[PDB]
Amino acid sequence: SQVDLHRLSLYLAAEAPVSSTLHLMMTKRLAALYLRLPGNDERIRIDGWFSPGGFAEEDRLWPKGDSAFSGYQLLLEYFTFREK
Amino acid sequence: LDIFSHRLITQYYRIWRKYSYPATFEAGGQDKTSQYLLGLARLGIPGCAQNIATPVSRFLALLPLMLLPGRTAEGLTSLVTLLAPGTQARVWHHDRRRIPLKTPLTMRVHHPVSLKSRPVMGDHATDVNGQVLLQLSTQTGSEVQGWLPGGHLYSDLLALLHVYLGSRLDVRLQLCVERSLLPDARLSCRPAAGSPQLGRTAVMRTQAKARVMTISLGRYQRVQEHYQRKETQENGDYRW
């Protein structure tokens, strides 16, 4: 009753040659999701999906100045540190 | 030779000041460097300030935004925040407006309407590409009064939109605040800037029955589309 299942922040802690590949498929090329519950069978069809969280507006990763333009700050993030 | 030393010293200090921007702010767009920034903001032509009628130096706070070819919601949010920090705002795209038609949709034989024109019935057409909605919300009576028609925040916001959006888009303005911050509609033999308006703010007193009330503030529009066409006498007619 306390566990927060609003959305799970799954981090793909893997080398680029595989993380970029898995990511693409997780968010773009899925067919169905299931949840296996011990004591029962495995084909429990559930409603859910994956969506990238890298492009968040919530964190921003800096004390953004009020006068700053977010579009350019985004570009710096992309080129400077990709893993985010 | 005292003047030689004096003059050289004077020039030194002038040269130093030359490159110290803050020193030259002078509480307005008075220095060349302030005007230079306004130039980059596309406000460098004399006579343009007179068409705004505001302390134009205000726009310097928005300078990084005015370097962009478009005008994003980020901008409108900044405008509101700047004028009255604490006030929140949200923007919706494709706000719907009704457009009167020049002619009704009718059936004809000689010059019939083609469906390629995507015709609609003859009274009104919709427009979802001409307006955006800017919704404000405050947490105190002071800010509310400032935003209400006749208030200083209402006026300032329009003064800024005049330049920031210009003729690109019209903006519909509304405010969402607790009923407890609104005045009780009352009559007066004489109108006033702060007087409640029939269709916007004139909320009746409640009989000691707070929820959030949505009231209108107004609409931003530069070009009124009035009629002074004066058809034509002649025209550009080169065959080339």
Side-chain angles (χ1 to χ4, degrees), chain B residues 37-91:
Chain B
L37 294 173
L38 291 171
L40 296 173
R42 278 68 160 171
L43 295 167
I45 303 302
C48 74
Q50 291 81 335
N51 291 325
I52 303 167
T54 199
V56 171
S57 73
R58 288 175 179 181
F59 288 104
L60 291 170
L62 304 171
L63 179 61
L65 296 169
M66 292 189 288
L67 302 175
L68 302 173
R71 296 289 181 270
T72 61
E74 189 176 7
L76 291 179
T77 299
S78 180
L79 294 175
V80 171
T81 299
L82 176 63
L83 290 175
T87 301
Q88 303 300 301
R90 293 180 66 190
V91 179

Side-chain angles (χ1 to χ4, degrees), chain B residues 71 97 129-130 161-171 220-224:
Chain B
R71 296 289 181 270
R97 184 170 72 203
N129 297 283
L161 289 171
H162 185 84
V163 176
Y164 190 67
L165 265 61
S167 65
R168 291 183 185 88
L169 291 169
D170 299 325
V171 181
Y220 167 77
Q221 181 178 343
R222 288 193 65 200
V223 182
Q224 295 177 9

Side-chain angles (χ1 to χ4, degrees), chain B residues 5 9 14 30 32 43 45 50 70-71 90 100 104 112 117 125 152 187 212:
Chain B
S5 294
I9 292 166
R14 288 179 180 276
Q30 302 301 307
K32 290 176 184 285
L43 295 167
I45 303 302
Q50 291 81 335
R71 296 289 181 270
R90 293 180 66 190
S117 296
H152 61 289
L187 296 176
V212 176

Side-chain angles (χ1 to χ4, degrees), chain B residues 116-181:
Chain B
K116 294 183 90 72
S117 296
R118 298 191 184 279
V120 298
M121 296 300 178
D123 287 334
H124 292 84
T126 62
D127 178 356
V128 296
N129 297 283
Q131 298 198 158
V132 298
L133 172 65
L134 175 60
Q135 179 174 289
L136 277 67
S137 178
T138 63
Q139 298 296 306
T140 186
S142 179
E143 291 169 355
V144 170
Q145 185 62 57
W147 287 118
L148 293 175
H152 61 289
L153 298 174
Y154 179 78
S155 180
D156 284 344
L157 180 60
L158 290 171
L160 295 174
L161 289 171
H162 185 84
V163 176
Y164 190 67
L165 265 61
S167 65
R168 291 183 185 88
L169 291 169
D170 299 325
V171 181
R172 183 161 66 89
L173 304 173
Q174 67 185 25
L175 175 65
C176 299
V177 298
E178 289 88 337
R179 176 62 179 80
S180 68
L181 301 178

Side-chain angles (χ1 to χ4, degrees), chain B residues 15-31:
Chain B
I15 292 165
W16 173 86
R17 182 179 174 86
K18 186 180 189 295
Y19 298 118
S20 177
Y21 178 80
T24 65
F25 178 59
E26 297 190 352
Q30 302 301 307
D31 195 273

Side-chain angles (χ1 to χ4, degrees), chain A residues 18-35 37-41 43-56 59-65 67-81:
Chain A
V18 295
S19 62
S20 61
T21 297
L22 184 61
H23 177 86
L24 190 155
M25 286 186 272
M26 288 191 293
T27 62
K28 302 301 288 182
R29 297 177 176 176
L30 301 185
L33 278 84
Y34 299 82
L35 173 62
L37 303 172
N40 207 325
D41 66 11
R43 295 278 92 190
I44 309 303
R45 180 70 161 87
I46 62 171
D47 186 16
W49 66 95
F50 291 75
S51 177
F55 300 96
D59 53 8
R60 204 85 268 170
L61 275 286
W62 282 307
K64 176 188 180 194
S67 72
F69 173 53
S70 67
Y72 294 161
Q73 184 169 325
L74 177 61
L75 292 171
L76 287 171
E77 292 174 358
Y78 179 82
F79 289 107
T80 302
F81 189 84

